[PDB]
Amino acid sequence: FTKVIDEPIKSIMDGIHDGHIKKLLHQYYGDDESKIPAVEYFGGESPVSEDSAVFKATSSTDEESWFKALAGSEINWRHASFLCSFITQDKMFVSNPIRKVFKPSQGMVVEISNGNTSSKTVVTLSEPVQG
Amino acid sequence: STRPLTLSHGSLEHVLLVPTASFFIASQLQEQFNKILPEPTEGFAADDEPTTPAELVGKFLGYVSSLVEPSKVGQFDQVLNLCLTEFENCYLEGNDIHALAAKLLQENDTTLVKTKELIKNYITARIMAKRPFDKKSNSALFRAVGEGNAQLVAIFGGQGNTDDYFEELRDLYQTYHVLVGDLIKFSAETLSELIRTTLDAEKVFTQGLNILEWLENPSNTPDKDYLLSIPISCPLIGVIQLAHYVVTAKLLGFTPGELRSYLKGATGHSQGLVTAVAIAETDSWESFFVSVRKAITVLFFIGVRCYEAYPNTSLPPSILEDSLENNEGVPSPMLSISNLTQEQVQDYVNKTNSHLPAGKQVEISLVNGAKNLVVSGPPQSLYGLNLTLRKAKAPSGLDQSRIPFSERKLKFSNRFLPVASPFHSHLLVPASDLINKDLVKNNVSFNAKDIQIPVYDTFDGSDLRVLSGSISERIVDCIIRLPVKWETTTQFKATHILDFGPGGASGLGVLTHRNKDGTGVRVIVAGTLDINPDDDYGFKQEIFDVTSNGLKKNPNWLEEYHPKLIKNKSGKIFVETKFSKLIGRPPLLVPGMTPCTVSPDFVAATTNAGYTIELAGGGYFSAAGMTAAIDSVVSQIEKGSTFGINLIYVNPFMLQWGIPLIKELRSKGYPIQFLTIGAGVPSLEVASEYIETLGLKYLGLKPGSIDAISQVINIAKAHPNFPIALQWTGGRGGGHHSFEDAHTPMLQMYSKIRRHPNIMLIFGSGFGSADDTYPYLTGEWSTKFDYPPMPFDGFLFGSRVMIAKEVKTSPDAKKCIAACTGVPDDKWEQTYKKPTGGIVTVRSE
Amino acid sequence: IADEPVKASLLLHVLVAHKLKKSLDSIPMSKTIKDLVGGKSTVQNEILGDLGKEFGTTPEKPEETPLEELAETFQDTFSGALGKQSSSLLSRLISSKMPGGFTITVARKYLQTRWGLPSGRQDGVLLVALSNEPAARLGSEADAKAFLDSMAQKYASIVGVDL
Numbered sequence A: 001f002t003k004v005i006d007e008p009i010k011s012i013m014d015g016i017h018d019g020h021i022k023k024l025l026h027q028y029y030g031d032d033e034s035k036i037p038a039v040e041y042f043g044g045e046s047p048v049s050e051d052s053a054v055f056k057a058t059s060s061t062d063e064e065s066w067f068k069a070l071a072g073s074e075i076n077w078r079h080a081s082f083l084c085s086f087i088t089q090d091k092m093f094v095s096n097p098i099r100k101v102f103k104p105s106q107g108m109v110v111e112i113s114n115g116n117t118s119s120k121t122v123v124t125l126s127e128p129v130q131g
Numbered sequence B: 001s002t003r004p005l006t007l008s009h010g011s012l013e014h015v016l017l018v019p020t021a022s023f024f025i026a027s028q029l030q031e032q033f034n035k036i037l038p039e040p041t042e043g044f045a046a047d048d049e050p051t052t053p054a055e056l057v058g059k060f061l062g063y064v065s066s067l068v069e070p071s072k073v074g075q076f077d078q079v080l081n082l083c084l085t086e087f088e089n090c091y092l093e094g095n096d097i098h099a100l101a102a103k104l105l106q107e108n109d110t111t112l113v114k115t116k117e118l119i120k121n122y123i124t125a126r127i128m129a130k131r132p133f134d135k136k137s138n139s140a141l142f143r144a145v146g147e148g149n150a151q152l153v154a155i156f157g158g159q160g161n162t163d164d165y166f167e168e169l170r171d172l173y174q175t176y177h178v179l180v181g182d183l184i185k186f187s188a189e190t191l192s193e194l195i196r197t198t199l200d201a202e203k204v205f206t207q208g209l210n211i212l213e214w215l216e217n218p219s220n221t222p223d224k225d226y227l228l229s230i231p232i233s234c235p236l237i238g239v240i241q242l243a244h245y246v247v248t249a250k251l252l253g254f255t256p257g258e259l260r261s262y263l264k265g266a267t268g269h270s271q272g273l274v275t276a277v278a279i280a281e282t283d284s285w286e287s288f289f290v291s292v293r294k295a296i297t298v299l300f301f302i303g304v305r306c307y308e309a310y311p312n313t314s315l316p317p318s319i320l321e322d323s324l325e326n327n328e329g330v331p332s333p334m335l336s337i338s339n340l341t342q343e344q345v346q347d348y349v350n351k352t353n354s355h356l357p358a359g360k361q362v363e364i365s366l367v368n369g370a371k372n373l374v375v376s377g378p379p380q381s382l383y384g385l386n387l388t389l390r391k392a393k394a395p396s397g398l399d400q401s402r403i404p405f406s407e408r409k410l411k412f413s414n415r416f417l418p419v420a421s422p423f424h425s426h427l428l429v430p431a432s433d434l435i436n437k438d439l440v441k442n443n444v445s446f447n448a449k450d451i452q453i454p455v456y457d458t459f460d461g462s463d464l465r466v467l468s469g470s471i472s473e474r475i476v477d478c479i480i481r482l483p484v485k486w487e488t489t490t491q492f493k494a495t496h497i498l499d500f501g502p503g504g505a506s507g508l509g510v511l512t513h514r515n516k517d518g519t520g521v522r523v524i525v526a527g528t529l530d531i532n533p534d535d536d537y538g539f540k541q542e543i544f545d546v547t548s549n550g551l552k553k554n555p556n557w558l559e560e561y562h563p564k565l566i567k568n569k570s571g572k573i574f575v576e577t578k579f580s581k582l583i584g585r586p587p588l589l590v591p592g593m594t595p596c597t598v599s600p601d602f603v604a605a606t607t608n609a610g611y612t613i614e615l616a617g618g619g620y621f622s623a624a625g626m627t628a629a630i631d632s633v634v635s636q637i638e639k640g641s642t643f644g645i646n647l648i649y650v651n652p653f654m655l656q657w658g659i660p661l662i663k664e665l666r667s668k669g670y671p672i673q674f675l676t677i678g679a680g681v682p683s684l685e686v687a688s689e690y691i692e693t694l695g696l697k698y699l700g701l702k703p704g705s706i707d708a709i710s711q712v713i714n715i716a717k718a719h720p721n722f723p724i725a726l727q728w729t730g731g732r733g734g735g736h737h738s739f740e741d742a743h744t745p746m747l748q749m750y751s752k753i754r755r756h757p758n759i760m761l762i763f764g765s766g767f768g769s770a771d772d773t774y775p776y777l778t779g780e781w782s783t784k785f786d787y788p789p790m791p792f793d794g795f796l797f798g799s800r801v802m803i804a805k806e807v808k809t810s811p812d813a814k815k816c817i818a819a820c821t822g823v824p825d826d827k828w829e830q831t832y833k834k835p836t837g838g839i840v841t842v843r844s845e
Numbered sequence C: 001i002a003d004e005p006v007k008a009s010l011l012l013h014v015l016v017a018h019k020l021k022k023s024l025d026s027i028p029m030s031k032t033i034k035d036l037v038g039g040k041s042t043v044q045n046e047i048l049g050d051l052g053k054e055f056g057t058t059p060e061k062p063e064e065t066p067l068e069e070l071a072e073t074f075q076d077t078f079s080g081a082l083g084k085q086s087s088s089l090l091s092r093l094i095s096s097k098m099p100g101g102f103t104i105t106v107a108r109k110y111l112q113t114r115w116g117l118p119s120g121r122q123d124g125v126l127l128v129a130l131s132n133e134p135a136a137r138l139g140s141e142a143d144a145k146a147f148l149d150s151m152a153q154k155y156a157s158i159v160g161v162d163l
């Protein structure tokens, strides 16, 4: 399968991947790209519905369970913000600080507005400041 | 009003809330039971000594039930009904005793015999409390079957599973006396009569057939050889299989017609097939005792006539000593041959048949697997064939790790079976006529319309019910003459299988799990109660359990690892496999390649092209070389994009300067997505360090052979929450290659890789296009080798990218690579001898 | 006597022998598990399970592989431990063979005082007592002690320690 000299690496891989997509699409969706399930962003997934809700974090709250809740189900921006463990800093990769901010300790009240609508979604953490 | 009564054995105790009106009767048993109960010891490791409170309540129940009379009202009737109710409430939280016994095994320091006695006691109490299993069980399995989430099928083993089959019957008599004691009493009676009905049966039954006395008194039970004789072993195997069926029906509270109605279809292995049709008739508990009488009568008449058509003779001690020195086994009429294809063994039997006359010829009887067969014939002949095979097999300890795959001498196993008659042979044909005449004389005849569920014929795999002729005559022919083809007769699409045959974990069930491994079928060993650590198949508990435990689905590889499609907002279609999900890029990566992928200018290009590539360590011999290259890539790549580093395990210098460096650049947080350790898998200790300390997304590994693969699994088994990319390649790969075929080690391991969802499995070597990879992505590539579909999660291309423009290989080097034709997958193993499509194998330093 | 970790070959050898109900030397070390009992296939999966519980990690197809080169691969991930199967065999022996009252403790202190063999040899001498199981009521403490002494010289003979 080595014949064409100086074929760009981008052109080979793309050519193979698209040849795969082309054979999956024909044999599992009768050549209909409208049948492909879309998401906002595709990645980060480890290989292992309320519009306005309120969570009360404890000093016993499970961190995974906590973050899964705060993220929600839908693939949107807040999904990434709570789940992604690394964020970018130009070309650098650093421990997601948002996960450190919201990290479940006793006294941490989370409210969510517009949970069903990403674009308007607003999380409002609340803590006892002076009492 | 209640007066509490505590009963203890050393440290452990249990409190029962006896009522004060009948407390004098229970406080009379407190002392008398603690008299029967032995002395406390450390661990309670002594036999007949309760280890848990539940066991102590059990032994109480068993003692109380012993002294009570079921016919005559005693003072201890309400005392049994309150202590059993208390046991039921505290310990049996809905689940069957089988689920508790299973829970005690894997939790407490409880041996198997302690569960057997506990269940015996509890089932004696419940039945003898005048509280039979008359209510319907809420078993998740049979609830799901009614719903239509599962389709049960019953299989029934036969001969050659275990030598001491009788000991499976003995246990039942002891552990379920109250459930099957009547049926054993019936069969025992029936046989006692049948031998007086057959003119020359008693001649065969030299040491009698008093099976009741053999159960009661082990001393009276004859020598094991006499038991193994087919006139005794045939009917009794029926009775064991009927026993296990009956015990399951009662404890579920189903009638024999109800349980038969729940199964989609039944079938048996050789003489098991008679048991399969025995349950297909039965309707209620009343019409059952003629359906057994039928079955047992068939197994009586085959079992005797086959012994009078081919009686086992004395064998010269010269053969026995030779066979036991090679340590194959005692010669029998049935020789198992594992790990060989049907044509190969067919070859060898032709050669052995050629020498010998028709009266001493061997034939293939069983076809139990793809590489599992059994030959039948005279034990002289099969010994002579065992002689022929021993010259062809490699020695057991022979290392062919260095020999190229093709010329490695094939290694396999050949033991004789624990059986007395060559079933499915021309040698038992002469019994056929005397079997039929006897079956018609004793008024046994199965009617197609009387059969309710489809029974599958062992020969062709069709339903029995479609027969024009006698069903009995076909069944006889199928057992004595026609060869079983087990894969052919298991073509049905069930979700669960119930092995009621003898042997249990060494019985037909486990064999049929192996055959259908990865086809989404769960086998359950109904005959034996134990714990499988692997949890690939189930035991008795899964039948009876009512929780989510009872319903364990075996994974179907085609469905669970289907290659789906997806697309982000920007309409960029991905292929969405287990790999692609984590990395969020297509599942096509460029491996680590010295020197192709040492050049930053190519690694940065491919990472900007949208694909994952490993920067090869093998071009840089110092920390300062990595850092200069890393930073040269970093400065070229787009924001938020990452790449991998390949290292070499067989260069301990490059590891000892390169691992601490990666740890320092990743503690500062460079975009090093992952680490691959090519050429040799690391030890569990080093691998654990790499996983924890580095702080990477995942850890690629490039295992060479089976031993490596299993060492990878072990690494993943330790960190099940950390992804581990197993980049399996054949010898047919470019660069440092093993002697191993790309496919065959996956065929023999895939199953054991997919038991850990944290292992992303990537297949590399000999790939350059979509068309050649596709079969491996979909999983249809394994259909060529007659396995279930076995899809893969990724694909790495070593040689395909060498001719790419961004690669720093000299234009004339490209022209030389292009010039090379290559070869098909078959011929790659000729590289050792001469140039093969312009490529040859040489030795390193 | 100086301390040495118990080798995997000895623990492997007593576990196979104690399933076979057989003595400590009647098994040849250069032999495969599938060869020993080539007839039956129940003791196959039973021994494979017992070796699993003992040393956790097991290599694929142990039955076709000789015990000596299995022992070296077992030794790599094993460090002088008893494990779940040898713990459950020991308690059984000490409760049913050794008299009630005579438990592991007193039996370990007797070898530690009279012989002065460390806590790692106590495992070995106890394992040799499993492989040649007395299969009898050793009620007489003196008898049991003398048997332990004949199991201390059997341990010293197989390993090569001088007493």
Ligand SMILES: Cc1cc2nc3c(=O)[nH]c(=O)nc-3n(C[C@H](O)[C@H](O)[C@H](O)COP(=O)(O)O)c2cc1C
Pocket: B591, B592, B593, B594, B595, B596, B616, B618, B646, B647, B677, B678, B679, B702, B729, B732, B733, B734, B735, B736, B764, B765, B766, B767, B796, B797, B798, B799, B800
């Ligand atoms: C030119 C070349 C260099 C390679 N260098 C390495 C290497 O440095 N380390 C390594 O573990 N594997 C190396 N390999 C093996 C590849 O990583 C990969 O396993 C193999 O190429 C797949 O076979 P294919 O080349 O037929 O696709 C190399 C292969 C080639 C062809």
